[PDB]
Design a protein around this nucleic acid. Structure first.
Lengths: 182, 276, 169, 263, 488
RNA sequence: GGUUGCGGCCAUAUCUACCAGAAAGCACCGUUUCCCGUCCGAUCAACUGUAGUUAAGCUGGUAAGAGCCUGACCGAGUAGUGUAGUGGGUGACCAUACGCGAAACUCAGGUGCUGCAAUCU
RNA sequence: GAGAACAGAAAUCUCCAGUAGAACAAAAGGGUAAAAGCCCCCUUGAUUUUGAUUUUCAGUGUGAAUACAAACCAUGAAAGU
């Protein structure tokens, strides 16, 4: 029913990982294995550790949104949640940092001649005859209009159009490897 | 004809899946909800239908296996004045409305949370193994605690009276199923035509002299009666537990001891080996 | 002792396997349409055979399944042409069974020279009450052995009514 | 064509890394009693936990190589092996890795004064919450064994990282103590490992705010004996401690407002 | 979307320090304290330790010897009610609670289908919140079973827009003002056109008010006040359904009407003028008010929320005898009537001269305060349910707050984006709903001067909101033809 | 004690072969107007608890069944290998030592326990 | 495996079963089963918006890419994904 508990050593808080560090003297025979009077020596220290922890936790600022129904990625307005600091204790990172960078031999050519990158706007070209849009590749692509239309105007020609793309598709695939090497 | 090598190789599934009762795959989403946003305790509203009974429970999530915050039964309804059609559409609303008023009372917002405080309450809904069909009476349980005030977030598609070609809901047809008017309609559909099946069905209403227009008055009267008293009086528990114990033990077949089966082993080779 | 566990009919399987797709296939559905009343269902070709001249996914057979007494109505009029007589094999070990005839017009049906002549596959499945436990979604279980069916119960039941015969044992 | 790709993206290295995966493995020398310690230890690591069905003859301080042959498959950085013997009884071998390469290991023999969760006066618990962490003793911070043990269970139990937290999730706490003080030369003592679930009390001297917290044992009551230790190379340590790296006279005010200080 | 600028690299290190347990340690200084009731009385000079208020409440409740819990306020410049003691003898300012809490509305029920037109007005029954009538752009009205969220008696009979409705404050009769000329009275249980429509206004109905419970004799139904756009005001009977008189006072259309507390009537009209009318002079004008420079919209009275409810509390328990109801409505009015031991009900006028005037029409013809500050015109002004705070709603997307005593400015509930249409109070005088031209509703703590929770959910503009007398549920009406019940 | 739901561990929980199972609760079973859904009220939906049935499910029991689990010095400190001696040996590999360090094999026993809530002679 | 006329080694239809010799986008130590397999239902994707890497001659409060995150979007009754 009293609340505030002192200790001989100022207990370090790490609130980011929700941590508590008593550094006081651990008496040996109080922690004897065959000692029946053990659990209270465990628990009374522990609940005095915990009570001090929440007092720092309740000494924090908190969030109060005013949103409502269908709060998609947030709290309710009746929720009021603890603004935490960063985990200061530096834990071992699992995996090394992934920096897989190269110049890819295009960017070099983009470096010399300053070809700026394009807008990346959209897939849809405008067609004439018909007046529709009918985007470039993905469905009824502007590429494969030649192989599907019904005449030629001067050995099949349409499979040649399939073949020359299979050069140029695989030329991506050939230029894929050499930048994967270097 | 199955080999003994296969008798070592097969993997037994979980008993709760070997019984046709629980999908863990569905339950798996109900454990790992977000959870990288926050640590907010997840509450599960479990609704089950056997024949002739309705079970609805708010169930927590516990490593011990679960803790149930509250329970509501269809046989609690004659305490509140419903005698027939215990498994209909309407009792599910009556069940759903019940448990919310009941659980608010033990919650006690009317009648640790520091820094405001009141904190309205949400439970998410267990489906169970029931098919998700619109107008089904399982979602009638969803309708009750919603009107009871439990914020189970949902949408209105599976509610009855949901139009297909347009995203419209009929509150007027919804009102009839809550008060069970379609039953009392089909009471009157069977009273005038084919009394012989109508002799069979509705016989308790024929026993109690209960007609169609009274049925709509039954529930609506009984609703605020639930809202008066949801407070879960449990049974008087006749024939206390040992009386239930020993009577079942008069029908309880036991294993045999090894000292008996050795006499049963020795009974064979004297009989089935020593020339009859 | 059968307090509930008598031996009613599950359903009649009506089936017509047409090796091709086309008017010979569609009329065979129209044969099933004017017979069963319901719309039948078409089995696709499972793989490529080509010895029948057929390839995969060819919508090969049409068939339809009728339950209830409505099945039993149709079930009699084939046995009419089958003259209330079925033979030995003609029976599963489970007790499920069937037969077939050509000339679908032998029972009811007018000739209709624009529809042609097909033959049908007749098949009847049998059950006792309680089979839902092997059929229901929740709490799906397995029927006990004494509750299961044999050929032996099936034959004794089948001679009994429909006035039927064993036709070589 | 594309389903597996997301799994490969889950196996990608990443700036903000995921919650690390624990892996529980029964070894060859396994019995019933060690098996049920696993399950009552699993409860804190729900959900991210996997088991086997097989006895697995792996001698970790003999050879480490099949462990990655598991770890690279199941994408589990943390691995737990089950082993009990005459010399090293009840040894629950713990492994931290680094990029499916063994960062370090630790032998942990368990004493026989243990309790399972059924042994406790049974209370509640909510599955999959972040606990709180209490380390009683300076020797966690100083001694290199216990620094590594502090380096272990912080990186074992904490689960999700957050900036924001509900009050309602704060149900339980994990307490770890070294068994009394010792000296460099006195034997490394055992691990006093207890777990409580909290209980609020409106205590009326903290006023409107502060409650009184009186714990109850929930367990599992456990005591670890230290065996031997494999350690990482210092070059590996630097790799496992690195920031992703991701302004003078320049300040943002409130409302953005990139300012320029003159001097 | 737009974002808050992030905390700094400097600021991230600041939060890492352990800090600031509010120990209130001993806490032993001792400073003297003076109590003061906020109506008139100052009562003495005592000095305890730095304590919580629950002790302080039980300190004051023995001083009078009550067994009545109070709200405490202090440091009044800047109005800041150990909680105060960290801010710096000390004068404590106390005031009753009317102990009840209404929980803030966060979620909703479903949206309710119904009539295929816009929604014009709505009102709860005072005796229960499960019943609530709505006024529609259709020719018909609608009563809702709010528990089931279903229609109860789709209510046919008018043939123009049902503009304004009201509930008889005992719980018997429903008025329905219509856009043609017509008023029909209604029964909630039967849903039947109770006799012929009350006919006799020549333009459309503007506002309907009831004669209050504590004035009607036991054994008699209350009468009705009617204000219509032709400038006529007719006091109808319900029993014989024949009006008693017209009054030809105002020149233009009459905006709004309220029945007074001391048997009076109050009429804002489009003549830039408010008249005071008396029933006991057989409908005769007694005082004329001339302050506004543009015409008057939505007058209100101090004790009207008591005058609206008619002898129900928030529990809504039904009284038995009409004399008991004559006591109870008198009781509830007297609890709000004589704050200063004085039957001085107060009136505030609102108009499009961006101005409100504070009135005590019985005591004088001079306005007390000239409320000022809005940029676009005010629309909707209502007192607090304890008759203590006056709120002001306007078209300048802002909701200002005023005193009820001297007309002193308090603050402004900024946060609305479009023009605020109307507001309504919670019963325990804490919360405040408001509908605006934008889709959302916004609920406001009067105590902390802040948005509690913004709630979206409609599809279009919102014309009508209303709060339930028990403090449980909230109905809403707008153009998008759906009814939405909002609750905690 | 039986039962029922939600479960935990997930074979001591299975599989196979028989038999038993008051009470209650399940189940099978009654139906096709509405809501819903099928080639088909078989399934799923709704309805009824009425007309019936414990026959299956299920719950126990039985079988030197199959499998499976624990304890033991069961191998066994064995195999193996660490380390230690200007050991022996043409090689391949073998005596002394002190460190780890196993299994198959044998014996002893088995055949789901448990969490929450509610209910039945 | 036991079955059903035409119908045969192979056409479709019933029952028993395969711990799966389901096809698993992969290749695998391993596992998904009311599936990551089969079928049906509903729908964009190359969206916007600012702190890290770049490149600019109207250095162009970014002008765009690119990196990140947030708002959104799709579906599901929902948990969620």
């Amino acid at each position: 029913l009293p609340v505030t508990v002192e200790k001989p050593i100022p207990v370090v808080y790490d609130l980011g990982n929700l941590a508590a560090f008593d550094s006081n003297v651990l008496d040996k025979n109080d922690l004897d294995s065959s000692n029946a009077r053990r659990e209270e020596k465990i628990k009374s220290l522990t609940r005095d550790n915990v009570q001090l922890l929440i007092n720092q936790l309740l000494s924090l600022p908190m969030k109060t949104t005013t949103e409502s129904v269908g709060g998609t990625g947030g709290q309710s307005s009746v929720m009021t949640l603890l603004q935490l600091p960063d985990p200061t204790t530096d834990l071992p990172r699992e995996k090394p940092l992934p920096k897989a960078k190269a110049m890819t031999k295009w960017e070099k050519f983009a470096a010399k001649k300053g070809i700026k990158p394009k807008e990346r706007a959209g897939k849809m070209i405008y067609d004439e005859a018909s007046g529709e849009w009918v985007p470039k590749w993905g469905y009824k692509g502007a590429n494969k209009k030649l192989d599907d239309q019904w005449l030629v105007e001067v050995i099949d020609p349409r499979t040649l159009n399939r073949a020359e793309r299979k050069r140029l598709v695989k030329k991506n695939e050939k230029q894929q490897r050499r930048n994967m090497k270097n | 004809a199955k080999s003994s090598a296969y008798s070592s190789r097969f993997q037994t599934p979980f008993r709760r899946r070997r019984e046709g009762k629980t999908d863990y795959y569905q339950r798996k989403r109900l454990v790992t909800q977000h959870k990288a946003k926050y640590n907010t305790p997840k509450y599960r509203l479990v609704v089950r239908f056997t024949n002739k009974d309705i079970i609805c429970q708010i169930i927590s999530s516990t490593i011990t296996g679960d803790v149930v915050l509250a329970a509501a039964y269809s046989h609690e309804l004659p305490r509140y004045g419903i005698t027939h059609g215990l498994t209909n559409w309407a009792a599910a609303y009556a069940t759903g409305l019940l448990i919310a008023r009941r659980t608010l009372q033990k919650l006690g917002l009317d009648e640790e949370a520091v820094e405001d405080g009141p904190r309205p309450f949400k439970v998410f809904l267990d489906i169970g193994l029931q098919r998700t069909t619109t107008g089904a009476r399982v979602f009638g349980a969803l309708k009750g605690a919603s009107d009871g005030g439990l914020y189970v977030p949902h949408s209105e598609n599976r509610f009855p009276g949901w139009d297909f070609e347009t995203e419209e809901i009929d509150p007027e047809l919804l009102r009839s199923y809550i008060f069970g008017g379609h039953v009392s309609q089909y009471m009157e559909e069977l009273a005038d035509d084919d009394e012989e099946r109508f002799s069979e069905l509705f016989k308790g209403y024929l026993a109690d002299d209960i007609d169609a227009d009274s049925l709509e008055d039954i529930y609506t009267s009984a609703h605020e009666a639930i809202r008066a008293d949801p407070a879960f009086k449990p049974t008087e528990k006749k024939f206390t537990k040992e009386q239930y114990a020993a009577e079942s033990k008069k029908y309880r077949q036991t294993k045999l001891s090894k000292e008996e089966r050795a006499a049963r082993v020795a009974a064979k080779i004297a009989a089935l080996a020593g020339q009859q | 002792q059968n307090p509930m566990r008598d031996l009613k009919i599950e359903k009649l399987v009506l089936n017509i396997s047409v090796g091709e797709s086309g008017d010979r296939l569609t009329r065979a559905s129209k044969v099933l349409e004017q017979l069963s009343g319901q719309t039948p269902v078409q089995s696709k070709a499972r793989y490529t055979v080509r010895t029948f001249g057929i390839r995969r996914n060819e919508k090969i057979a049409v068939h339809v399944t009728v339950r209830g007494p409505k099945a039993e109505e149709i079930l009699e009029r084939g046995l009419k042409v089958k003259e209330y007589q079925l033979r030995d094999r003609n029976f599963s070990a489970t007790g499920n069974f069937g037969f077939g005839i050509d000339e679908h017009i032998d029972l009811g049906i007018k000739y209709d020279p624009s529809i042609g002549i097909f033959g049908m596959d007749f098949y009847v499945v049998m059950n006792r009450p309680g089979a839902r436990v092997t059929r229901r979604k929740r709490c799906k279980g397995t029927v006990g052995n004494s509750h299961k069916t044999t050929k032996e119960d099936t034959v004794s039941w089948f001679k009994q009514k429909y006035d039927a015969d064993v036709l070589d044992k | 064509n594309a389903r597996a790709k997301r799994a490969l993206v889950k196996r990608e290295a990443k700036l903000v890394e995921n919650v690390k995966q624990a892996l529980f493995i029964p070894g060859q020398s396994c019995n019933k009693n060690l098996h049920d310690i696993m399950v009552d230890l699993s409860a804190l690591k729900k959900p991210d936990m996997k088991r086997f069905n097989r006895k697995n003859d792996i001698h970790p301080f003999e050879d480490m190589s099949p462990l990655e042959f598991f770890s690279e498959k199941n994408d589990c950085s943390l691995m737990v092996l089950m082993t009990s013997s005459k010399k090293r009884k009840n040894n629950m071998t713990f492994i931290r890795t680094f990029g499916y390469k063994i960062y370090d290991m630790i032998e942990l023999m368990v004493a026989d004064n243990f309790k399972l969760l059924s042994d406790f006066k049974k209370l509640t618990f909510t599955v999959g919450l972040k606990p709180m962490f209490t380390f009683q003793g300076a020797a966690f911070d100083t001694h290199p064994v216990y620094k590594q043990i502090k380096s272990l269970f912080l990186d074992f139990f904490r689960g999700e990282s957050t900036d924001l937290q509900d009050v309602a999730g704060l149900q339980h706490v994990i307490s770890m103590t070294i068994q009394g003080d010792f000296q460099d030369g006195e034997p490394l003592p055992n691990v006093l490992f207890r777990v409580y679930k909290l209980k609020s009390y409106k205590s009326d001297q903290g006023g409107k705010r502060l409650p009184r917290i009186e714990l109850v044992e929930i367990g599992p009551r456990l005591d670890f004996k230290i065996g031997r230790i494999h350690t990482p190379s210092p070059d590996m340590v630097t790799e496992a401690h690195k920031k992703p790296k991701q302004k003078k006279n320049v300040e943002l005010d409130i409302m953005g407002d990139k300012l320029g200080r003159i001097h | 979307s737009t974002l808050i600028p992030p905390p700094s690299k400097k600021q991230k290190k600041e939060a890492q320090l352990p800090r600031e347990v509010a120990i209130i340690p001993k806490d032993l200084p001792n400073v003297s304290i003076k109590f003061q009731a906020l109506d008139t009385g100052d009562n003495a000079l005592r000095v305890p330790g730095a304590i919580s208020e629950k002790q302080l409440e039980e300190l004051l409740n023995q001083l009078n010897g009550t067994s009545v819990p109070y709200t405490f306020s202090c440091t009044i410049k800047a109005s800041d009610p150990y909680s105060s003691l960290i801010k710096p003898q000390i004068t404590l300012l106390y005031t009753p609670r009317a102990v009840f809490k209404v929980k803030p509305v966060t979620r909703s029920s479903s949206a309710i289908a119904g009539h295929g037109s816009t929604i014009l007005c709505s009102a709860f029954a005072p005796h229960t919140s499960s019943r609530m009538v709505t006024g529609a752009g259709d020719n018909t009205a609608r009563i809702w079973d709010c528990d089931t969220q279903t229609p109860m008696h789709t209510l046919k009979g008018h043939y123009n827009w049902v503009l304004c409705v009201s509930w008889s404050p005992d719980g018997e009769v429903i008025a329905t003002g219509s856009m043609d000329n017509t008023i029909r009275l209604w029964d909630p249980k039967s849903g039947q056109c109770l006799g012929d429509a009350l006919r006799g206004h020549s333009k459309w109905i503007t506002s309907l008010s009831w004669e209050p419970i504590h004035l009607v004799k036991p054994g008699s139904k209350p009468r009705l006040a009617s204000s219509s756009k032709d400038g006529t005001i007719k006091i109808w009977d319900t029993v014989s359904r024949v009006c008693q008189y017209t009054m030809s006072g105002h020149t233009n259309s009459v905006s709004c009407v309220k029945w007074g507390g001391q048997g009076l009537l109050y009429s804002g009209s489009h003549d830039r003028t408010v008249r005071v009318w008396d029933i006991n002079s057989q409908g005769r004008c007694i005082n004329i008010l001339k302050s506004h420079a543009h015409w008057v919209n939505h007058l209100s009275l101090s004790t009207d929320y008591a005058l609206r409810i008619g002898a129900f509390d928030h529990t809504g328990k039904k009284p038995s005898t009409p004399e008991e109801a004559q006591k109870k409505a008198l009781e509830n009015y007297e609890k709000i009537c004589k704050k200063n031991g004085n039957s001085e009900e107060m009136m505030v006028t609102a108009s499009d001269d961006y101005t409100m005037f504070l009135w005590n029409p019985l005591k004088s013809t001079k306005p007390i305060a000239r409320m000022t500050g809005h940029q676009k015109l005010v629309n909707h002004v209502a007192f607090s349910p304890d008759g203590r705070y006056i709120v002001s709603a306007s078209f300048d997307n802002s909701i200002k707050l005023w005193d009820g005593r001297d007309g002193k400015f308090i603050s402004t509930f900024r946060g609305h984006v479009a023009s605020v249409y109307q507001v309504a109070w919670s019963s325990d005088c804490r919360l405040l709903v408001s509908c605006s031209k934008d889709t959302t509703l916004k609920v406001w703590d009067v105590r902390t001067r802040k948005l509690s929770v913004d709630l979206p959910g409609h599809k279009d503009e919102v014309y009508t909101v209303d709060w339930s007398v028990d403090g449980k549920r909230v109905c809403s009406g707008g153009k998008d033809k759906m009814v939405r019940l909002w609750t905690h």
